[PDB]
Write a protein that binds this ligand. Structure first.
Ligand code: M7G
Length: 674
């Protein structure tokens, strides 16, 4: 399996993640459940954090709203999910397949719980207050209804196999007996708002409830009354955001109770110090290890080497693992909240990978961290909208160019906390391409200019030193230099040659026009593609044969990839432009549009391509031979990038909300699926 940057855990679900001893962690994300092996079984270096994304539960067609592991010894491999598609599925995580399922619910399911006491019991509840009890082994059921209120959470008793606690949207908490046709045994009034979490005392009774009303309440089953009220402290920061108050009652420390707080802070409440309402802040000493937005779920995981771990899911899109013994953050697994549109490695900071995501946050992945496989920085300043284009500055470290789907073009400094400069001139459509190169008139009359291409077909030339100034339409220069009466084509791609002496423009009609410095004289037009040009890449200038740097790969809405050698036509320097209609090489194999191509900086004529067919293909372009096909993604690939340091390592991003880091040598398939 490849190293994976997963989709964000789902929000506002009382229980859409869970863990089992060993062990294995699973979290709902969009329509799937992603499994994470944690501990010795993850197979990681003694330095790097002991975890790894190993699998995915695929089958649901709508949002997964609930997830629960079977905590019965021997059946830690069984789990259950709930979905907005109306179904409850039982899974086998070792085969990622569905054992059995049901669709008994007639309304949108809220959550579900695997009974801690009965091997095959799974209780679920929907937003009309309907509860189904499901025994999957003998395929039995029990339609129940308690109160005409929206169910938010439910938790089976770990001690009594017939007791189930249910929390509602209005603050009502009930404990029912499922053997007595769902009779309300206790009715707990006190909360004024949504119940988010319900935890029973691990010792055989007491139970704790967490609510949006900022209070935690401990109740006694004997008296059916509340014995303790814990209100959240108004702590200091370390934006209108509502609270989510979830709980964990550690079986090791029955006198302690873990909860979330404002801003995603985690708290450990000492219940013996009742009147003192004494708590301890998680990672109280260290800064920046804590979540920055609210926490939704908490899952206890004891590893095989007896480590007490706690996993948290958050709105800040991080998944964190805490050591309960120290209350410190062991590690962090970042996640994506949208499409992975662009990938770009810096030529200055060689291992620095920038990721353009559809949730309005730029990720910078330090792929060279020895102690951390997921060293990822977030940048949300002045972005908001989807980042659809990225390009590092070629010489200035920490300077990143970015473009958004609403036509914005910006300059972000990642070494500092300076707000990004936003260009005044913007495109009427999505910025699909950015490129650095030598400034052309009128700008040249800065060392490098930032070029941006938008969906409307305009390519703007930006000034780095004066971003708020006026960006120039290069069509105004092309029209004059090459003397063109009729209108110019819709540009869809821009790619500079390595020497900065040649700029290539791809168009909606499928043609690629070849211009040259300093006035963009049209010396060549490639008529090969008959559909919109998506991507163009020039070969690097440090191959065995320096004549390789005249090779140009291109991808369009057709599945066929073309390579064109431009040694002759460029070195001939024709005053009359030349039309080329023959490919120097041809790469067939993909079955859908090509979104991205890139040359390996480690080899000669080795190309990687990203396609809507759901795969990435590695070619030996010179011999037109497919080498390996990566099929890890479940969606359509939007971008691909070669590791600058490892010749065997490639990164890819798709609309499945995933970035995969994979090895060419580990791929069994050689060509795309047919
Ligand atoms: C219009 N357009 C679409 N793409 C590619 O196609 C993806 C999305 O294309 P889309 O038109 O936004 O939606 P659709 O193709 O699924 O119907 C983007 O992530 C790009 O990789 C494009 N890529 C480039 N370079 N230029 C373009 O004008 C362009």
């Amino acid at each position: 399996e490849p190293r994976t940057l997963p989709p964000s855990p789902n929000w506002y679900c009382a229980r859409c993640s869970d863990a089992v001893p060993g062990g294995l962690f699973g979290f709902a994300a969009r329509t799937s459940v992603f499994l994470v092996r944690v501990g010795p079984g993850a197979g990681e270096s003694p330095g790097t954090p002991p975890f790894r994304v190993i699998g995915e539960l695929v089958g649901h067609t709508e949002r997964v709203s609930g997830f629960t592991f079977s905590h019965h010894p021997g059946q830690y491999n069984l789990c259950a999910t709930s979905s907005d598609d109306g179904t409850v599925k039982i899974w086998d995580v070792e085969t990622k397949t569905v054992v059995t399922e049901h669709a008994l619910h007639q309304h949108t399911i809220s959550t579900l719980h695997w009974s801690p006491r009965v091997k095959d019991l799974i209780v679920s509840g929907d937003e009309k207050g309907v509860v189904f009890c499901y025994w999957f082994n003998r395929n039995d059921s029990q339609h129940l209804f308690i109160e005409p209120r929206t169910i938010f959470c439910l938790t089976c008793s770990p001690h009594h196999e017939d007791l189930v606690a249910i929390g509602y949207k209005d603050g009502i908490v009930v404990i029912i007996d499922i053997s007595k046709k769902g009779e309300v045994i206790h009715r707990l009034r006190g909360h004024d708002d949504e119940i988010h979490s319900i935890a029973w005392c691990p010792l055989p009774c007491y139970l704790a409830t967490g609510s949006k009303d900022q209070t935690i309440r401990i109740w006694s089953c004997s008296r059916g009354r509340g014995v303790m009220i814990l209100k959240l402290p108004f702590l200091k920061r370390r934006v209108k955001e509502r609270l989510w108050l979830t709980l964990h009652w550690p079986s090791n420390q029955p006198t302690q109770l873990v909860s979330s707080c404002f801003g995603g802070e985690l708290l450990q409440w000492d219940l013996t110090q009742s009147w003192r309402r004494k708590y301890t802040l998680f990672s109280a000493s260290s800064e920046g290890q804590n979540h920055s937005r609210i926490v939704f779920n908490l899952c206890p995981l004891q590893t095989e080497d007896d480590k007490q771990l706690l996993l948290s899911t958050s709105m800040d899109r991080d998944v964190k693992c805490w050591d309960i013994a120290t209350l410190e953050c062991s590690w962090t697994l970042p996640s994506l909240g949208g499409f992975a549109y662009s990938l770009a490695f810096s030529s200055v900071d060689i291992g620095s990978l920038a990721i353009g995501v559809g949730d309005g946050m730029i990720r910078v992945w330090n792929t060279l961290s020895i102690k951390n496989n997921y060293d990822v920085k977030n940048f949300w300043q002045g972005v908001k909208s989807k980042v659809t284009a990225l390009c590092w500055h070629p010489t200035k470290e920490g300077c990143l160019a970015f473009g958004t789907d609403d036509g914005k073009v910006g300059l972000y400094d990642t070494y500092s906390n300076k707000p990004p400069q936003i260009s005044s001139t913007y495109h009427k459509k999505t910025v699909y391409t950015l490129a650095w190169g030598p400034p052309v008139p009128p700008m040249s009359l800065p060392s490098l200019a930032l070029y941006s291409c938008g969906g409307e077909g305009i390519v703007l030339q930006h000034n780095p030193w004066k971003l708020s100034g006026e960006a120039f339409d290069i069509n105004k220069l092309i029209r004059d230099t090459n003397s063109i009466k009729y209108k110019l084509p819709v540009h869809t791609e821009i790619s500079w040659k390595a020497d900065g002496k040649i700029m290539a423009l791809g168009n909606e009609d499928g043609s690629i026009e070849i211009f040259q410095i300093p006035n963009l004289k049209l010396i060549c037009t490639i008529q090969q593609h008959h559909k919109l040009v998506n991507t163009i890449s020039w070969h690097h200038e440090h191959g065995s044969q320096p004549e390789l740097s005249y090779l140009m790969a291109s991808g369009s809405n057709n599945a066929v990839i073309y390579v064109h050698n431009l040694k002759t036509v460029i070195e001939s320097s024709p005053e009359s432009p030349v039309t080329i209609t023959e490919p120097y090489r041809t790469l067939s194999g993909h079955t859908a549009k090509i979104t991205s191509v890139a040359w390996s900086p480690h080899h000669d004529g080795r190309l990687v391509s990203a396609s809507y067919d759901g795969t990435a293909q590695v070619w030996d372009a010179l011999r037109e031979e497919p080498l390996c096909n990566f099929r890890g993604h479940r969606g359509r690939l939007l971008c691909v990038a070669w590791s600058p340091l490892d010749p065997d390592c490639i990164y890819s991003g798709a609309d499945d909300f995933c970035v995969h880091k994979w090895l060419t040598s580990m791929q069994d398939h050689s060509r795309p699926p047919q």
